[PDB]
Amino acid sequence: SMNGVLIPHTPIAVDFWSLRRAGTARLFFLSHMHSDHTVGLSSTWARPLYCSPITAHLLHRHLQVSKQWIQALEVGESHVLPLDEIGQETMTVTLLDANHCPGSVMFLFEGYFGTILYTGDFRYTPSMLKEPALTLGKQIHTLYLDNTNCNPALVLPSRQEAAHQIVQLIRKHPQHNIKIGLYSLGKESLLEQLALEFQTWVVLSPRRLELVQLLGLADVFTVEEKAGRIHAVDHMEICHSNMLRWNQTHPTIAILPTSRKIHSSHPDIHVIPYSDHSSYSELRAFVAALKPCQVVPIVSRRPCGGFQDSLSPR
Ligand SMILES: [Zn+2]
Ligand SMILES: [Zn+2]
């Protein structure tokens, strides 16, 4: 899927890389390095690209986008970007920690269009309201929201509570190897927590270890499989056939940390609602505190509602 947006009546494109559809009167932004946000973005990209410093490093390393075009913006600062070559108009952009994955940010856009807050992918935490850029009384005219888990019937625990569910599960199997199905990026802090909790080395891929060292996490990761019982694998590897394959070597439990209602054939495959996306209740509190004039879903194909009673008149 493609979860990028061309914001109408603005010079803004976020996680949206189709040259034909975007046009030439746009500035391009990248919230984070998940593949559904970099569709069409590769080493051939030849336009200015604005992102976080961590995203900037990952972008050049793994997609080979030239450093000529990569524009790393410091988080928490107001950046003034030119919209033309004659110093006629500018746009002010402020990056805010999205609490989603390494490098993930929210964008605060200010310009002729007004004020727009673009969350990208984010997990709401109350500290986001205490952001200096959001405590200036500025009216947010449009709030683009991560509506991934925007289902009122879907109750999700906090990441800490979900991490506890994972810990409890692993505790029941002290003799088992543990397969954690992940994307190439994200939930590294979960791995670090599991490493310390069970005093084990967490086996990664050479790519992940390279990433972890950038984050400056604890020295608890390695590429040698014989070193630990907790293994970070690609989520696609977790299925019935691979469970039988893995059990030939050692008793194995597989864990899928996701808010998606994935069902498994194998009894030893566990799907636990550990999510990097805000829950419905967290979304409600986020919007209620900001009170924007309008709320627009980033994930168009997915449901998004229940925010009329939290909007602002202006
Ligand atoms: Zn994401
Ligand atoms: Zn996404």
Numbering used by the authors: 0 to 313
Publication text:
The two human DNA exonucleases containing an MBL-fold are SNM1A (also called DCLRE1A), a factor important for DNA interstrand cross-link (ICL) repair, and SNM1B (also called Apollo or DCLRE1B), a DNA repair factor that also plays an key role in maintaining overhangs at telomeres. The SNM1A and SNM1B/Apollo proteins are both classic 5′-3′ exonucleases, requiring a free 5′-phosphate to initiate digestion, but are members of a class of DNA processing factor family that have not previously been structurally characterized. The protein exhibits two structural domains: the metallo-β-lactamase (MBL) domain, arranged as a sandwich of two mixed β sheets (α/β-β/α); and the β-CASP domain, which is characteristic for a subset of MBL nucleases: CPSF-73, Artemis, SNM1A, Pso2, as well as RNaseJ. An extended active site in both enzymes includes, in addition to the canonical di-zinc catalytic centre, a binding pocket that defines the selectivity for terminal 5′ phosphate, and a wide binding groove which is essential for processivity and for the ability to digest past DNA damage sites.
A 2.16 Å crystal structure of SNM1B contains a single protein molecule in the asymmetric unit, with two coordinated zinc ions and two tartrate molecules at the active site. Motif 2, H31-X-H33-X-D35-H36, contributes two coordination bonds to each of the two zinc ions. H99 (motif 3) contributes the third bond to zinc-1, while a single oxygen of D120 (motif 4) bridges the two zinc ions. Zinc 1 is coordinated, in an octahedral arrangement, to the protein residues H31, H33, D120 and H99; two additional bonds are formed with the carboxyl (O4) and hydroxyl (O3) oxygens of a tartrate molecule (Tart_1) from the crystallization buffer. The shell around the second zinc is also octahedral, coordinated by the D35, H36, the bridging D120, the hydroxyl (O3) and second carboxyl (O1) oxygens of Tart_1, and one water molecule. The binding of tartrate_1 to the zinc centre is suggestive of a possible catalytic mechanism, whereby two oxygens of the phosphodiester to be cleaved are in positions similar to the tartrate carboxyl oxygens (O1 and O4), and a nucleophilic water or hydroxylate ion is coordinated to both zinc ions at the position of the tartrate O3 oxygen. Tartrate_2 is held in place by direct interactions with the side chains of Y182, K186, T257, S258, and S274, and the main chain amines of D275 and S258. The tight binding of tartrate may mimic binding of a 5′-terminal phosphate group of the DNA substrate. In SNM1B, D35 is held by a hydrogen bond to N2, which probably stabilizes the zinc-coordinating rotamer; there is no corresponding residue in SNM1A, and the amino-terminal is too distant in SNM1A to form such a contact.
